[PDB]
Design a protein around this ligand. Structure first.
Ligand SMILES: [Ca+2]
Ligand SMILES: [Ca+2]
Ligand SMILES: [Ca+2]
Ligand SMILES: [Ca+2]
Ligand SMILES: [Ca+2]
Ligand SMILES: [Ca+2]
Ligand SMILES: [Ca+2]
Ligand SMILES: [Ca+2]
Ligand SMILES: [Ca+2]
Ligand SMILES: [Ca+2]
Ligand SMILES: [Ca+2]
Ligand SMILES: [Ca+2]
Ligand SMILES: [Ca+2]
Ligand SMILES: [Ca+2]
Lengths: 228, 225, 228, 228, 228, 228, 228, 226
């Protein structure tokens, strides 16, 4: 019944605003979105399992291929992982892609690495989600086994880039330059979008500010909007 | 998007209850109809299935159904289902196959008796060893990104609530994680089996039917008698 | 690891000839074939389950996407089905597509209806496999729910075609003209092929006679061979 | 290398016995192995990163496609992961498959879930590696994206097996029945194997006891050995 | 794909004619080509970057392993090179082989030296692409590191061939005699081919004039065509 | 593109049987062989230049490192030599190693002395190929200049060995004892092998009788087959 | 004669100091070096062809495998190249690896990108040698075609590295990160070394300051020295 | 020490008297090695004749390379006596169709006999090899490509300077392999540059001629024993 994914409704850092999320999900149908991509933080650090449960219940109404990645504050990891697992059981079109992958009709190989991707230091998943660069790279190296697929990466950490963020991660930029994904979604306020090498890097907007975007994969065109 | 499902099982030839069942659809707010066999008693003939399907078609709503253990030989149920479906696109037998409902929802089923082992039977009755039921549903793995709705005649095993149920059917549910599972049986009820919502819509030959609220995983019970 | 399918190694009616089948499989690596399509009769009517089990074991050594449908003599239906189910549990790249379907990388929607597709009459699955045309059509009806996929069909029964067989089945030709599959493979001795509407209809050859063909899907061209 | 992996040299639980590891690697050439599968614990809980580096350095000397998963004592998880990442940069045919996958000649999809797979409870990766069943099921569900490959699974926890291992895990048995891997390797002492449904389940032996096995994937039989 | 490349769709000097190029590409699938070889000029000297981008975009739709070298007019070198690099990040099967190499299924070592190969003089890459013979020889000597592969060379400049093209370059003939490539593709109008010693030297045709050839590597015979 | 040599497809004395040679060549992709080693007689004495050309054309289809030496009947020497020279110009992965050498990835220093190595007498290259031991030794002494390479020798003449052939040559045995090659391939019927000091001596089989072997270099083990 | 490369004599920036070059060369035998690697600038910008001729003549007296790359000042590029081409004709052990590669006994795949590697900008090779990062990256990608080789990279531009330089190039670091070379040699004063990922990055010293290093490839350690 | 000075000559044609003088000049000449091109003996010469030749040459006790001339047939007699002297003196080496290394290292290889444009090979009535055979011999050197090479041929390459009637095929072998030095047979000591290769005609010893080459400077020092 579903067709190739061209339009992708997306946003980031909802930080627990379930009302805005409901509106976001509510818009989906009339925009013609083929799928949804959401970047954390889904919740503030203090949230607990039941909060994610509600968060995912709301998101499940979309009934569209949906992919997400957690944010630096979505800790401990297992609460997000458990509620993600629970909703995905009967809503298989939904998919947490943190450290893993999935295929969208196209075909498109979707994969991601959420949380804070730090230059170095030790990994953390309880007081926060922090991953040193070598860990992020190890997660994506699995993709080299899959052949001839255009990629879509979801990250929270922004790649270094002069016309997007010169404070961004060189390590994330390295990940993008290595895999050459067709699209890279990252967390950020103010819908923006630049080309980084052959990769279209989009900051869909921050939903905790009511922002979101609808991307045209084929034309690499970006249509923005707000929920307020 | 399908939310309310008017549902029932085991009509067993009672065409009067069927019409009353159908006549309900509008008042219930039903978005769709699901029906599990036995559609007809074993002795039934093709002409019987034709009349059955004609009344069902009057609902003019997305309708899905699987045969029961005595809807044999299989070909008679199939041909008449083929005939009514040529005319009403919203009508659909999902035994060993599938279709889509507004949402979308992947609706699929395996009717007849799903027995633990033994040989398959489709003439004297409809019986399928567990390996055949599993072989049919494995095709759904080609369409893994859709919430599913299963229609079975045979109930699954459920510890502390239904020790008579089939462990094999339970395994198919645990494996595919359907959002909703409809099974044949007398007396409206439902329980959560793992992450799947298993409902017994009621037995129509007893005037029983249910109206499910797929969103709240709840149901309104009713009777045509 | 697998790439898109462009070259299909195909044949028909091996009729239990295990030596031929084996040699046929052994050709895959030398040719670069990306997939195998085999039409029945796989075994003579007299064959039993342990015969099918031996057939599938040899076929499983290909380690290639493989599709098949049975012939009029592959009865009773349950023995062929049980043994296909057995080998397919651990070699999921293999698939009996009789009455069902599967996707190959391309993508291609592979579906089939084996056995003898008769004009009318009664279905038979025990003394032989025979299905009235309305059944075969009923089986393929499910595919209409699947959107925009180029299709590949396997039938044992030849469709009516002024060039391939003026005595072929008119009903089968109707399924073809209706679904407009990209490719249609059918049982028959002597490799040959023609266009039926916008569908490439191919008779890969009869392995019992040692015949096979390597199909260049994009070109609608065929290379012929014989295992001797 | 052979076209299809057939002979696999395997063992489990070396528990820091590096002399035994060196002898295991030393004899690999003589066995004609096409690949190596090793199940943890690779090291005792008290071992540190430098210990894993030594372990991997010795293992990499076999110069063969090698897959491994950690045991319940290989904690914290990041030390094993880090040293696995490191050696894999230098020897790309070496591969930790814990929570992920790789392909072996065939092609075979090799995947695993190391650590202790417990019925329920909380996940642990610092004092030990313990994953309740819902987490192991979540890791493997990603394989449905790559459903057309015969599979080889690596687990530390053994599945429940009526008559053979009444103490085994029902959840691990369920994962095997769900995914139908062709070969399942598990940790344990005393080389042995049995069929669990369609799956060939092998306990290759405990290296800290000097044991190892050379599997014949074709015949589904094994040749036992000891380095002592 | 076939395991060994046998049919090569080839042409030269399209000179910016995007229309003929589109027909060349649209026509490829029907030829049953295993690969495509294109010799410049790809564009007239006046064309700029954007022109090379459009050229590559169209060529990339053939979805076949494709090798190419620039002509005397594809200057300045860096625009052709930059656009070649950009499109190859997206379509790995595309490869500029000017001064470098790549492998085609076989394996065949594909290499070339585009531009005008002059007997002497100074090298030029801005006003035009001209390379004195010592440079071409220098580029190709790297191939002695990859000694065990049959070679396919791409040159704009034609070699001297006693009695057929006595205006041809003796230096280029010397390169061919030294490396013994199995196949040599060169620019020129009017499809033709001859054996220069053991090497099959082919002038596939000038596309600005709608000409192209489909080579049969095995028979060392070619099929001619025109996009007229 | 080529990896280290581990498996070698081998055979001897095909005696002009092109159908067998072709089946032999087609075995390579299915077995995964990394190289091919072939011992004469390639052709019966009666054969002339054009026959060797057909033989080499068929062998050239393998596209794999290949080494061969002539047998006592491959005379006059210059016919075998010219045709080897011809095919090796454009398929440089093939190599007649008679009185010379080549390197395979591993590395392995491959060399040979074909023809009949007689204890004494006069050399002959026209009515037959026969060389007295001192000539064979003189050819092999050139290798001492090449340092630290495991050696692979190809001879037609079998060495004296109580296990392999009690009537074999003591001189050849002596050359093997002096050079200490890793592998020695010799002509003979009935696949078999033995150790001669630290050297693995293999009789790969007689292709005229349809026999061949796939040697596993690392294991000094052979797998047997026949092309019937 | 030559054996596997283990000890490398290296230095950088001789800047035309021929006397120091002679001393550097005269030291080779005393150091027991197996090879020499030299990074530019070979000459200051003012130098001309006859100057490179004198330089290469002195370097050739080493009689050892030797690799080099030009510096930012070795312009115009064609003079350096031409004199490299000249000396390399009869001294093939010598090799300018700028944009290409060679193999050293080991084996080690030796490659380089000399000159100034800048983040972006236009390529320059006449007034100076300057290459934007996308060019450096494009040169090295050809290497992915060569399998399982440990790599040795020669660069003039230093990679960003919290230890040896925070002003280093992030792009050069990216190249090292993607290829994981075994050894990376870079220009710089003061002999020093650090590990970057799995790569040993060495600053061998500045020859114009009398500095040089003797690397021990296997131990990843080096001895320092000065010629004045 | 690394080979720098090479004492060379060609075509002694059985003149053992001249050969002995040639050999005895080696010491005061400071030669590091010796290279000798055929014909070593007239065609009528037999095995014991070659044995005498090699005995005198072996007295030099310096790395020595040689190839045979068109008249050194049948090939087997030259070969056997070369094998015999070489078993005893490791520095002696026939490089016809093969190779050896001199201190440097330098890869020394050669193809003696007459290198003819085409035709059939001959090794009994005389030594003649069509160009394709010479080329097939030398291609083995691509397996040892990182060494500077020293080539020995009896046949001279084509060159406007040295010889207008020279072989274009031999010239092509030189252009392909880029040998550092190439010694060929001929009368009158001389040398020219063929591309980057230094081609040297050391002289015809049956006329007393010989040369002492300085490889590093690419210069000749001529001399005569008569
Ligand atoms: Ca929390
Ligand atoms: Ca984790
Ligand atoms: Ca009935
Ligand atoms: Ca039967
Ligand atoms: Ca059926
Ligand atoms: Ca292989
Ligand atoms: Ca620990
Ligand atoms: Ca293929
Ligand atoms: Ca231009
Ligand atoms: Ca350039
Ligand atoms: Ca003959
Ligand atoms: Ca300058
Ligand atoms: Ca004589
Ligand atoms: Ca000879």
């Amino acid at each position: 019944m579903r067709r190739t994914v061209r339009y992708i409704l997306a946003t980031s850092n909802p930080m627990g605003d379930l009302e805005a999320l409901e509106k976001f999900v509510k818009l989906a149908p009339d925009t013609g979105a083929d799928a949804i991509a959401l970047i954390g933080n889904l919740m503030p650090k203090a949230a607990k399992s039941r909060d994610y449960a509600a968060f995912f219940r709301i998101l499940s109404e979309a009934h569209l291929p949906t992919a997400y990645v957690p944010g630096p504050q979505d800790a401990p990891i297992w609460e997000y992982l458990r509620e993600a697992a629970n909703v995905e059981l009967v809503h298989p079109e939904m998919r947490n892609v943190h450290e893993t992958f999935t295929f969208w009709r196209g075909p498109y190989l979707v994969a991601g690495v959420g949380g804070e991707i730090a230059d170095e230091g030790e990994p953390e998943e309880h007081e926060a989600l922090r991953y040193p660069a070598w860990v992020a790279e190890y997660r994506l190296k699995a993709l080299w086994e899959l052949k001839d697929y255009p990629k879509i990466f979801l990250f929270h950490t922004m790649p270094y880039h002069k016309g997007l963020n010169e404070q961004g991660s060189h390590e994330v930029a390295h990940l993008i330059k290595t895999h050459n994904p067709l699209l890279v979604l990252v967390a950020g306020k103010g819908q923006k979008h630049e080309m980084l090498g052959a990769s279209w890097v989009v900051v869909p907007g921050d939903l905790s500010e009511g922002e979101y975007s609808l991307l045209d994969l084929r034309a690499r065109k970006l249509e923005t909007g707000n929920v307020r």
